[PDB]
Structure 1
Amino acid sequence: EEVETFAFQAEIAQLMSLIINTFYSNKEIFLRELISNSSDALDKIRYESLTDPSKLDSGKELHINLIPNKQDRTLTIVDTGIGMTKADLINNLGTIAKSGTKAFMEALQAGADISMIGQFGVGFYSAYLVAEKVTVITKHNDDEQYAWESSAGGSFTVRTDTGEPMGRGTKVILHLKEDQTEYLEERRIKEIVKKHSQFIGYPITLFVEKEKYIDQEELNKTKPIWTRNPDDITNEEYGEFYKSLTNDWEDHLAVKHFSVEGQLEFRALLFVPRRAPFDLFENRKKKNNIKLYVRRVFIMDNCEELIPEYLNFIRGVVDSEDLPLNISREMLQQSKILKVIRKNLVKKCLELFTELAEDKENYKKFYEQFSKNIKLGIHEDSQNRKKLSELLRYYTSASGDEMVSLKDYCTRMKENQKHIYYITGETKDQVANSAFVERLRKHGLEVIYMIEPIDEYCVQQLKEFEGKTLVSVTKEGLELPEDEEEKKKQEEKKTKFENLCKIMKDILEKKVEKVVVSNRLVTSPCCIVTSTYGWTANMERIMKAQALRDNSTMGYMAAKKHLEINPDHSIIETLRQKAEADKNDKSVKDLVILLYETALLSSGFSLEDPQTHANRIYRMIKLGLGIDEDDPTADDTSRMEEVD
């Protein structure tokens, strides 16, 4: 058939408007773009002088000057880079999607040390976000000095300059809009510059008129150091960098500097601070303090995808030279990249901690600040759970005041220690003196003391260490490596007190699930234990105390209480004899309740109504003191025989 063929066209007027109004969300970036263009201009001249030094005959200092002018509502940026010839000036600034730097890089041969920022061709025009008019003055070594002028009117002009020679380089003058004058203030400048530039290879000097004279203040004093081989960096150097980066008067605790090669190129510095921040779990700004740079230009911060939350205390920098960006250069074009970055950053953080742990003194300093984060990692990171667990330290019944690892536990333990025993509670003293661990102490078994509330969750998730499961000494069914003779004696004793098992349950029918004869008590007449499933003491108080929780769940998850009796206590034996003689003896009923309430307190449970515990005691005190009974106390017949 007949086919007509056409080239694509573009409407310049609309295209110009889109660049100005729809590509960028934050006007402050105009400065970023102008600075980046200048740093490229400087790299290109540097590259050329590398093989032919005469290129710098026109001047050797490579630097960027920022010169605001209040009086004219203008801002001038001056570099000392190559500059542009008349032909380039027209072709590169007059063509909306052309890029001279891209062409330059294409011209360059492999092995060049040149890394340039840009390739899109539309960045310059961002000047019009704040400028009314833009003037560009430039001098190239091979041409006359020329002045370019425009506004986004759809045309532009070129004339020969008549002013002072620049020697070489490009000078960009913005004439600002009346309401954009905030960009002429020194404070605002410096804030923008610090945020978006910072690691530019050339110095930036800001020229400020003061009480007049010009105060020449240099920015970019801190150099990136991640670019250096780590072998070559001293600890002092890392420390100074760190302090500058975080405005932290204190040094780092630890640092990991590494690189990744292949597919995605990386360099990164990860620092561990010596103090956890007070707002570590409270600040509402995004938690990951990792800044992402591309070709040393800041791109993104506060990115959730880079690091799992449990590691939100690591401070650091990630820098790459090959990731795709969107048009505004404010975010990555493809999210799968972040998936990879995250995998590698986590892997190396764990290596750092593992190594850190070999130094016991330093590990203590570390653990004391960040043990909370490790524990959260146990709950959430299902892949590194088997590595994170080796970083845990606990006080135990053996260990005096030292905290020990789980590995340490498991080498001191005994041939019959098929299980790892632990107890949880509010504080070390209460736990240490608990009835629940006395039998274990008697036989020389070690018990791990878990104190922080968070531990209640970790034990769920942990289950076992090297094949040995964890068991709670506060639950029913605790297995001890008892002798067979001991087991037989314990069973013989169950043929006794049968009546108390029943009587006590009846007294306390509405309060407990079971009354049983036990063996974990070698002190105390009784204790309360929880059945194998459901919330235990501590788990319940913690949940009840949360600021924001649905209490409807407490109608499902609750302890089932069993009361354990020590048959070799004198109270119990006396009650057996007394109760068998008279099961309705009122004094038995009252003392059984008192023992029950006492057991709840000693076992870690609160009382339903503490007042009526207190009243029982007060009554006994009054009798004990001889308080006269005057205050403690006040002191047809066949109808009910009817058979119906």
Structure 2
Amino acid sequence: TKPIWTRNPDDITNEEYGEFYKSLTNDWEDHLAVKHFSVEGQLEFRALLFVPRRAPFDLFENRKKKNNIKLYVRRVFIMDNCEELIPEYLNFIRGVVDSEDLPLNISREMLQQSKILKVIRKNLVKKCLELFTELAEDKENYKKFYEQFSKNIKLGIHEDSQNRKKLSELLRYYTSASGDEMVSLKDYCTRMKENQKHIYYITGETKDQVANSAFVERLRKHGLEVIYMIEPIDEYCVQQLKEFEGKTLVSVTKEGLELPEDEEEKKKQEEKKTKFENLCKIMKDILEKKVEKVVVSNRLVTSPCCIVTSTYGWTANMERIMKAQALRDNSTMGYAKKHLEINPDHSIIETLRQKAEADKNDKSVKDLVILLYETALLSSGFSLEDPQTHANRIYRMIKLGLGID
């Protein structure tokens, strides 16, 4: 009688859909979700789409399967891999597309097919984003989905600038407040204190490393929520996600960390600015060019120091990923400028300011400046120049802790 995608959506049982999706992809378990829609107008076409349970494989990047949408015209099969029928970041969708009107045999000149496809393209991506917007309403079944295709969503953020807002509403992250849960961007905004003009994120490799890192200290004490961006995609994602609902994004690993001045803590921070600037310009010289600037931390509580990164430059996470990639492709590392922030109110920083402003030539002072700098790189997610150099330096500091002999 009629093919399965011509019967209309609410007249089909979810198991009938599944038997079809199994027969279409040989997947051993049924579909996860289904969107099934038709279109009339200048163009008549139907479309049945499936989202597999287990995220498909990355396919050699061969790009030899831009998609797996079986393509029909007037109920006859045509192609299996239709390059411009679906944007690359939705290639996991399985299903069929049955057009009534598109032109098949075409030369270069007949761009009309490429118009019909572009409109079907936008209509297919629209009905998908609709389905994901639908899925986001049941919080704990959307979990089975974002678990598999989070990497896919973030890719769209980078490529499809036209749908960037609708896509960003679908992102979920770990934050400081959501101790064990993932939360939307709209939720983080509902918990913002007014006059906070920024959304705080940190990029590392594990939650425990970014949660207990040095960079977030005076931000968690300040009652602020910070977003944990742990997957390597995130480093590229934020590069094109400028703002959400008006508020701009800021990295807690970068210099110039803006915070709300209350009862002009800038006046106390300014006294610290000038009080320790002596110590600032000394360690800049003890280190020479291993660092670019030495400034007073406005973000450090329990740790004495941290290594922050240039504003318009690579980060510790990026520097790790890129150079972990340059192992794979045999290459010189080629051509990341760091800033070191010191906590004025820490005893090690206070006591160091005394020994240094008394005798800045003391080889013990030089040794301690280098040592704190090296451990700060460890805190900030970097790799050391020469590990045994730091090792011998720690051994010397241990010699000082107990009997020097």
What TM-score comes out, normalization by structure 1 length?
0.59
8 A contact 1:299–1:331 mirrored in 2: no
8 A contact 1:325–1:332 mirrored in 2: no
Write the mapping of 1:231-380 to structure 2, written as runs, cut at 5 A: 231-279=10-58, 282=61, 285-326=64-105, 334-380=113-159
Q: What is the CA distance between 1:340 and its match in structure 2?
A: 1.9
1:435 lines up with 2:214 in the alignment: yes
State the SS of the aligned residue for 1:470: strand
Aligned residues: 405
* Shift in CA distance, 497/343, structure 1 to aligned 2, threshold 3 Å: closer
Identity of aligned residues (%): 100
Aligned match of 1:392 in 147, 162, 171?
171
Distance 1:588 1:308 in 2: 59
Gapped regions of structure 2 (runs ≥ 5): none
- The structure with the largest alpha-carbon Rg is 1
Distance 2:37 2:27 in 1: 23
Higher relative contact order (CA 8 A, sep 6+): 2
* Shift in CA distance, 623/483, structure 1 to aligned 2, threshold 3 Å: closer
Alpha-carbon displacement from aligned partner over 1:172-208 (angstroms, at most 9, x marks no partner): xxxxxxxxxxxxxxxxxxxxxxxxxxxxxxxxxxxxx
The answer to which of 377-386 and 331-340 deviates more is 331-340
Write the mapping of 1:517-536 to structure 2, written as runs, cut at 5 A: 517-536=296-315
* Shift in CA distance, 504/256, structure 1 to aligned 2, threshold 3 Å: same
Q: What is the CA distance between 1:229 and its match in structure 2?
A: 2.4
The answer to which of 456-465 and 478-487 deviates more is 478-487
* Shift in CA distance, 481/625, structure 1 to aligned 2, threshold 3 Å: closer
State the SS of the aligned residue for 2:201: strand
* Shift in CA distance, 477/551, structure 1 to aligned 2, threshold 3 Å: farther
Aligned match of 1:482 in 261, 279, 284?
261
* Shift in CA distance, 329/623, structure 1 to aligned 2, threshold 3 Å: closer
8 A contact 2:9–2:36 mirrored in 1: yes
Q: What is the CA distance between 1:397 and its match in structure 2?
A: 0.2
Q: What is the CA distance between 1:499 and its match in structure 2?
A: 2.5
Alpha-carbon displacement from aligned partner over 1:350-384 (angstroms, at most 9, x marks no partner): 11111011111210000101111111111101111
Distance 1:504 1:587 in 2: 13
What TM-score comes out, normalization by structure 2 length?
0.93
State the SS of the aligned residue for 1:371: helix
Gapped regions of structure 1 (runs ≥ 5): 1-221, 628-643
* Shift in CA distance, 506/622, structure 1 to aligned 2, threshold 3 Å: closer
* Shift in CA distance, 489/543, structure 1 to aligned 2, threshold 3 Å: same
8 A contact 1:515–1:564 mirrored in 2: yes
* Shift in CA distance, 572/231, structure 1 to aligned 2, threshold 3 Å: closer
State the SS of the aligned residue for 2:200: strand
* Shift in CA distance, 424/462, structure 1 to aligned 2, threshold 3 Å: same
Distance 2:36 2:261 in 1: 54
8 A contact 2:71–2:77 mirrored in 1: yes
8 A contact 1:517–1:564 mirrored in 2: yes
8 A contact 1:526–1:563 mirrored in 2: yes
Distance 2:33 2:115 in 1: 30
* Shift in CA distance, 548/566, structure 1 to aligned 2, threshold 3 Å: closer
* Shift in CA distance, 501/326, structure 1 to aligned 2, threshold 3 Å: closer
The answer to which of 430-439 and 561-570 deviates more is 561-570
Distance 1:281 1:390 in 2: 30
Distance 2:273 2:97 in 1: 68
Q: What is the CA distance between 1:467 and its match in structure 2?
A: 0.7
State the SS of the aligned residue for 2:55: coil
Distance 1:626 1:575 in 2: 21
* Shift in CA distance, 455/248, structure 1 to aligned 2, threshold 3 Å: same
Q: What is the CA distance between 1:567 and its match in structure 2?
A: 1.5
State the SS of the aligned residue for 1:612: helix
8 A contact 2:71–2:79 mirrored in 1: yes
Distance 1:256 1:566 in 2: 55
* Shift in CA distance, 622/520, structure 1 to aligned 2, threshold 3 Å: closer
